[PDB]
């Protein structure tokens, strides 16, 4: 993490093993690059406009497209690792209870997104809407999927 | 003209440039005239013509040839690794009146 | 850990350090590219670069120095060699025309032209440094630029930086053998500055070293690089409590008050010790007290001045390795008691232990075997002055005749200088035979 | 100790090696300079 | 909804145009279609844009500037270049028959003709904005259409817009090197029009920029293209906090309330901190701490003047890139000690600061090289009076002898303005040693 800016808690790989990714709880969106024979990683920092938020959760698409972020506001940014800028922010209205803790993007469009209530959430990408919701009891921390993702199983 | 009997016909190891066998204007932007074009040393390759052969031409490149082929594993154990000034400042949180908040488990 | 730029001028003190920054960047692991292989997170970061180094970010550590020399061919062979992406361009000051060897044209008329681009680059270093101990200025008192532009140097950063430990690496010309035919003059005219704002100057021959490397290191034909390898050692235990911990850490401000008696009396010499060979190193034990034996010996000193024929008055013993101190206290004991090795009366004393936790790191390709207990002397003794008198007796020849003289006024100098410097060396030798008296 | 003093020779001995295959060739040079 | 409108008058103007706007749509994602591709864009909008440019409906950000010069080569060459679908085709104002260098060319003959149609387009221009904050103008101080047609446009811009901050970027004629032998003369001629139907004016000179891609960038023999960039890259300092994020945004009127202490004295100096070349910017460090030093060092200033020969009256740096705000104050605190920058008795402060969020953006096919950090210093200076009266001695003398006054007198003119110019700049003089004394 920079200097101006806090420290970061996540971490996350990719569909090639040279770029590494991290979020903050302070807002260090990174996307950093790796090189073994020089034998250092180069980052970058990824603008957002003015929009500094408090993250805690990370999910990534199965065809490298684009990374989703869980924040603690209730807003699920999604931004481009190849062009590192934004893409989409979260609900507009209706926003999510104490901050998204869990994010699992499945192998379609779409994207799990769980909260500290246990509001946990099936969307779809451009409006970030709720299409079918279950409430469980406890703030979700784990969203898994049993491979194919027919059967995930979600911790508290 | 010396032909340059192949290789080992010199004191420098090598054959030699073939050469000329039109003057584009090019406004170029790191050095001082036109007229002088190895003014500082920039297109002169001295150093990677002198990694190809076993002694070097000039004693001055003697500095740094068997650099690549350590013969004593370094022992960085008995460093002065500055622990005062990185374990007692702290970068920016102020965790002190912050909640535990997300992931405090404590052992 | 604190920091210490080093200005190398001449091109003697560029090629010495040619030697040193080889073996700097060696004992912490920057390569030639300027790059640690090993980050400073991997390794608990251990910032004993710092002392010589300064990172940027992208791990590209810096060498703390500035290289001048006012003619360009030595300073090009850096920016072309194995070491240019290393060192900075901005670092690497060089000039037009050659100080031809002569005071005049390196103090007074060629040595203006570039004054001012090394004090701002001095600069440059001295404010990102927090804690700047001392310049160590590498140059050789027998010829141009080396004689010269250091001179001038010396007043600059006096009035600039004041009290900063002005050190002072420097190489004396030898009794018989010589490179420059002008050597006398620009020898005892810039001893000037060095009597003044030089707090610790430091002499080497260049003779006594080929007598070691014939003698010790087993080698015949010996060339000018094996000559600037000792050199490098004689700092990187100078250095080597400033970057690697040890038992008795000493400073260098430690290093003066522990060595300067009296203000004038300034002149240290420089011995390492357990400087033999491989062939003759599976030969020796080599533990403590035949390297504390060493240094006190006279075919292994480093300038031609025997110390039987005069008395010592300070002399810091700095140990690197694997040295226990009881093996020291004993070898202190035990060389105390020695009739030929004189102290004076005004030091019932004795010697400044120094001890390090950090074996000297070989140079792939030089001719030091590794030892795993070394010592480098900076002894202070009476036996300089006859060193200072062989150069004295031999100005005194050619300028009574007044030769080679119209290359020197007829260059910005006043003839007046020449006989100011020769009553100063007068009074530096009369210093130096009379704060030797034994008082009773 | 044993270990990389052992190597130290091997340097030693490929340094001076090397300058002997060096000094051979200007040796056949100035040969063939004289053989013209 | 922070617009302002750059006016670009004469050929330097222009050709400082042609790389100012190639640096503007980089930094806010514009081809030269004028067009910003989905990629480079922040989710959503990003508003970040609308200061310099003007969304028209279909996707195309047209340059809110007024391009004109009377005579077609150089317009027409921004018509046949790589922008000409990024300019409107009205925004680019020609008439025909150049001013040959004559400041009555541009306000006699060839200047009346054309004012109307500029002032409409800077109209419709103005009336497209919400927040216009300024009038950024780029003329030339030498010239014909340069000086000249200028002086018509803010005598007619005061009268018409008001209060609006008028800023200037100009070209001043250099110490020892110009172009035409009318150069000296026709400065201060348009020194009636700057110190009042303005606000503020920075200054810039030739054989400045020269100096500074001679011994930072190492472009010895540079052309105008390189010079405009650096000049460029300066108003996108300034110009920084009215359109991206950080924080202390330092707004025009923000500026310039803190800038420019009297009524009249309003010429401030300028320094881009990093102007290192490429080679040399992974050979630094490039912290807070020296390029904040990198703008007070007297080889670094963009006009031709020693800053040590007079005195900083108001000082402003505004941080371009990742800057932390506690280093500016050490940095601040530093500058307050060093002797060398004597402030002034009445301006216990001195110094306002401006720390943006958004890195410096590279020229692809530059020279400067990509710093994640820069500072812009604009000072206003007891200092620059001497460049004032560097060109005041070459009217005197030229002056004098009547000469060259025909074709100038010529074309429509009274001879008495000549004095009254003069007296204007004497006057200019006067106010300025004036002010740096200090008050009992
Ligand atoms: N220790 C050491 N001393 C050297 C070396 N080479 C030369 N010297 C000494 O340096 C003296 C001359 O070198 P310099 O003082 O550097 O001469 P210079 O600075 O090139 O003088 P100019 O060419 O006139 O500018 C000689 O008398 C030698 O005694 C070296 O490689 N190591
Ligand atoms: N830095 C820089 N200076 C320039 C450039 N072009 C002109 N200048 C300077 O500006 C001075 C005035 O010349 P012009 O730009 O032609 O001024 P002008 O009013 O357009 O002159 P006319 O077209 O004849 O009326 C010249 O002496 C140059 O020194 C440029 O592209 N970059
Ligand atoms: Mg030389
Ligand atoms: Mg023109």
């Known amino acids: 993490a920079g200097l101006n800016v806090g420290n970061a808690t996540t971490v996350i790989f990719s569909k090639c093993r040279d ?30 406009g003015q929009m500094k938020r408090i993250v805690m959760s990370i999910s990534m698409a199965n065809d490298d497209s684009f990374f989703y972020l869980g924040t603690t506001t209730g807003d699920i940014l999604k931004m481009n690792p190849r062009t590192k800028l934004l893409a989409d922010t979260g609900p507009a209205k209706d926003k999510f209870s104490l901050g998204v803790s869990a994010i699992c993007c499945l192998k379609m469009g779409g994207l799990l997104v769980g909260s500290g209530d246990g509001l946990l959430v099936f969307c779809k990408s451009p409006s970030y809407k709720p299409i079918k919701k279950i409430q469980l009891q406890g703030g979700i921390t784990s969203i898994t999927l049993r491979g194919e993702g027919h059967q995930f199983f979600v911790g508290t | 003209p010396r032909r340059q009997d192949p290789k080992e016909h010199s004191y420098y190891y090598r054959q030699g440039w073939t050469g000329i066998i039109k003057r584009d204007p090019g406004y170029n932007q790191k050095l001082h005239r036109d007229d002088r074009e190895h003014a500082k040393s920039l297109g002169l390759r001295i150093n990677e013509e002198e990694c190809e052969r076993p002694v070097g031409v000039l004693s001055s490149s003697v500095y740094g040839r068997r650099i690549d082929q350590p013969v004593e594993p370094l022992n960085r154990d008995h460093g002065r690794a500055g622990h005062v000034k990185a374990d007692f400042y702290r970068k920016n949180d102020i965790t002190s009146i912050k909640a535990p908040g997300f992931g405090h488990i404590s052992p | 850990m604190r920091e210490c730029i080093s200005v190398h001028v001449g091109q003697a003190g560029v090629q010495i350090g040619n030697a040193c920054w080889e073996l700097y960047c060696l004992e912490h692991g920057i390569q030639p590219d300027g790059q640690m292989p090993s980050d400073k997170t991997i390794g608990g970061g251990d910032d004993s670069f710092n002392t010589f180094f300064s990172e940027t970010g992208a791990g590209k550590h810096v060498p703390r120095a500035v290289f001048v020399d006012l003619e360009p061919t030595v300073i090009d062979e850096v920016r072309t060699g194995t070491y240019r992406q290393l060192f900075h361009p901005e670092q690497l000051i060089t000039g037009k025309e050659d100080a031809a060897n002569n005071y005049a044209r390196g103090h007074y008329t060629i040595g203006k032209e570039l004054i001012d681009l090394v004090l701002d680059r001095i600069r440059k270093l001295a404010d990102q440094c927090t804690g700047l101990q001392g310049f160590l200025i590498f140059h050789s008192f ?8 250091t001179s001038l140097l010396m007043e600059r950063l006096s009035v600039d930086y004041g009290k900063k430990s002005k050190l002072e690496f420097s190489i004396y ?20 500055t060095t009597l003044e704002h030089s707090d610790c100057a430091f002499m080497v021959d260049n003779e006594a070293i080929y007598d070691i490397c014939r003698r010790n290191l087993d080698i015949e034909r010996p060339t000018y690089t094996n000559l600037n390898r000792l050199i490098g050692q004689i700092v990187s235990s100078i250095t080597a409590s400033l970057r690697f911990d040890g038992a008795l850490n000493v400073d260098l401000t430690e290093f003066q008050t522990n060595l300067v008696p009296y203000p004038r009396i300034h002149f240290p010499l420089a011995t390492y010790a357990p400087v033999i060979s491989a062939e003759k190193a599976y030969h020796e034990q080599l533990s403590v007290a035949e390297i504390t034996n060493a240094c006190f010996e006279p075919a292994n000193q480093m300038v031609k001045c025997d110390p039987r024929h005069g008395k010592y008055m300070a002399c810091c013993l700095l140990y690197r390795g694997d040295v226990v ?13 020695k009739r030929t090795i004189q102290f004076v009366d005004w030091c019932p004393t004795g010697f400044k232990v120094g001890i390090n936790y950090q074996p000297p790191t070989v140079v792939p390709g030089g001719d030091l075997a590794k030892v795993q207990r070394a010592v480098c002397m900076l002894s202070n003794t009476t036996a300089i002055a006859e060193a200072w008198a062989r150069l004295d007796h031999k100005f005194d020849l050619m300028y009574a005749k007044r030769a080679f003289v119209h290359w020197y006024v007829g260059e910005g100098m006043e003839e007046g200088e020449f006989s100011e410097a020769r009553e100063d060396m007068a009074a530096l030798e009369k210093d130096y035979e009379e704060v030797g008296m034994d008082s009773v | 100790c044993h270990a990389i003093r052992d190597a130290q020779i091997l340097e030693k001995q490929l340094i001076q090696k090397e300058l002997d295959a060096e000094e051979k060739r200007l040796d056949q040079m100035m040969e063939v300079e004289r053989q013209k």
């Open chain 1, 19 to 48: 770029e590494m990714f991290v979020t903050a709880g302070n807002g260090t969106i990174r996307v950093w690059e790796l090189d073994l024979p020089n034998r250092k990683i180069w980052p970058t920092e990824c603008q957002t």
């Open chain 3, 325 to 337: 101190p009881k093996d020291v206290n004993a070898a202190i004991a035990t060389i105390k008691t």
């Open chain 3, 142 to 149: 027998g010829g141009g630029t080396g004689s010269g532009f």
């Open chain 3, 173 to 192: 010309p030898a009794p018989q053998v010589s490179t420059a035919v002008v050597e006398p003059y620009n020898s005892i005219l810039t001893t000037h």
